[PDB]
Amino acid sequence: RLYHSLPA
Amino acid sequence: RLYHSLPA
Amino acid sequence: MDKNELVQKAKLAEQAERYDDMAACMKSVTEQGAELSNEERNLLSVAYKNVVGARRSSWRVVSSIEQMAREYREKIETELRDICNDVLSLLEKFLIPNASQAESKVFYLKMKGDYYRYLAEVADKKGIVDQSQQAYQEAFEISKKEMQPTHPIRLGLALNFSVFYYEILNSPEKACSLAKTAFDEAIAELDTLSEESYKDSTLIMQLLRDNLTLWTS
Amino acid sequence: MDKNELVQKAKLAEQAERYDDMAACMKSVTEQGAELSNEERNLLSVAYKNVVGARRSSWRVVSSIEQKTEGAEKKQQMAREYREKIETELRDICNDVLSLLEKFLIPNASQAESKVFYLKMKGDYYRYLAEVAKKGIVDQSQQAYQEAFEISKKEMQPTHPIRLGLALNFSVFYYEILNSPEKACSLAKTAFDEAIAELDTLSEESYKDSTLIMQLLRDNLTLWT
Questions:
Q1: Which of C7, C9, C12 is most worth mutating to test chain D (most D CB atoms within 10 A of its CB)?
Q2: Which of C45, C131, C158, C192 would be C182's cystine partner, CB 3.0–4.6 Å?
Q3: Are A6 and C207 within 8 A, CB to CB?
Q4: For chain D, what is the total number of helices (H) and then of strands (E)?
Q5: C172, C104, C109, C184: which is closest to C140 by C-alpha?
Q6: Cα–Cα distance measured from residue D69 to residue D75, given in angstroms and rounded to the nearest whole number
Q7: What is the CATH number of domain D1-225?
Q8: Which chains touch B (3 or more CB pairs under 8 A)?
Q9: CA distance C119 to chain D (A)
Q10: Hey, are the CB atoms on C210 and A4 less than 8 Å from each other?
């Protein structure tokens, strides 16, 4: 997955 | 630690 | 331990990258039933994100390798599933019910979205996805209502909901419209950003943008 | 289960970065009593180095917060207790390894390469106990290393990665555990100098391992000097 969701 | 021992 | 002590231990666990400990502490603070502070909300979230994250990353590896591989993947999937069900149950029994402030409601509904979305990644599947979509949509409505486009929680939410559309609903155009509207609206109002939130809001605007670049290239 | 199955599972665990799982697979494999193969030995080693490594890194972080919270009653008490909880898991790991070594690995090591690898490992794990103890653990670490050091000086060429890696960790033992930087530097320098004197003995197989260790040796010497 090259797209990202919100990192911690 | 700046110095190293053998890495895994 | 006591709430304060647990919060203090969660912070140390966090620094020691002992996220299972961090999560156990924050699950304990959550189980006492007082509403979580913003600091406590963020500790909870960071803990479980890392706990579940380890399992998602492992699952990806092993699912990609995949009978030995399947059993292992199955094994990793059950831990993963238990962690999400854990978070979802805390959210359902304590956090969502007790929220009351709009920011927290958005935060927790976004988190319910996320954890059903992690369940959807390994998924029964149609209901999980619907549960994910339902939580995100209600979070998204309140956030447009109570929130202003540069608010990090609202941007955060747009970011993950856009991923949900892209990844789980397999809808690139809705993911992109969500990300682009979110970005456009924030960048139109940068003077609305506080000193407290500007770094988080601009980092998240860039994530929206990086996603959009990937999805439209 | 069958060793090949447990080995397969350890390797899957390794790719999953599930090191406690990897170590439990390799511990079961070792407890089957047959001398481990090169591949099996290395899996066991990676597994445990990663399991103890996570706890040494957490320990150092909490230990450094404990020092930095001098004058802060509550913070320090919490830091101290969490340090002690981490320290116990760390000793349990080290103790598990050390008993695998004493019961199984050292006693079945058939070749000098293996004996040196395992005696080094024994020095390493005693040295990890010494990091959180300094007590007669130090002597166990030293004796293990010394004996490994002696065998490798006789049985292995100066560029053999096992011999270099042993020199590297024994120099770290002197530096950090015995607080003897002059001895640490002399051990590292000797090993480095003896290996670069024989670069024509580097093999295809060991080239990268040996040269990475030579550089760690030299990088340590750079820092200690």
A1: C12
A2: C158
A3: yes
A4: 10, 0
A5: C109
A6: 6
A7: 1.20.190.20
A8: D
A9: 19
A10: yes
Resolution in A: 2.0
Do A8 and C49 count as a contact with CB atoms less than 8 A apart? yes
CATH architecture of C1-217: Up-down Bundle (1.20)
Strand, coil or helix: D158: coil
Q: Could you tell me if C88 and C120 are in contact, meaning their C-beta atoms sit under 8 angstroms apart? A: no
In chain B, which residues have their Cβ closer than 8 Å to the Cβ of D168? 4-6
Rounded Cα distance between C97 and D70, Å, is 41
Helices (H), chain C: 3-15, 19-31, 38-65, 68-90, 96-98, 102-122, 125-146, 152-163, 172-187, 198-216
Question: What does D46-73 look like in DSSP terms, one character per residue?
Answer: HHHHHHHHHHHHHHHHHHHHHHHTTT-H
C 51-70 → A contacts, CB under 8 A: 53
Q: What is the rounded CA–CA span in Å between residue C175 and residue C173?
A: 5
Q: Which residues of D touch C13 (CB under 8 A)?
A: 82
Find where tokens 């003896």 sit. D194
Taking the C-alpha atoms of residue D16 and residue D19, their distance in angstroms, rounded to an integer, is 8
Residue type present at position D60:
R
Say if CB C196 and CB C146 are below 8 A apart: no
User: D and C: touch, per 3+ CB pairs < 8 A?
Assistant: yes
The experimental method is X-ray
Neighbouring residues of D215: CB distance < 8 A, sequence distance ≥ 6 = none
Q: How far is A3 from chain C (nearest CA, A)?
A: 5
Give the torsion sign (CA, C181, C184, C189, C191): positive
Q: Say which amino acid occupies C179.
A: A
Q: Tokens for D31?
A: 């407890």
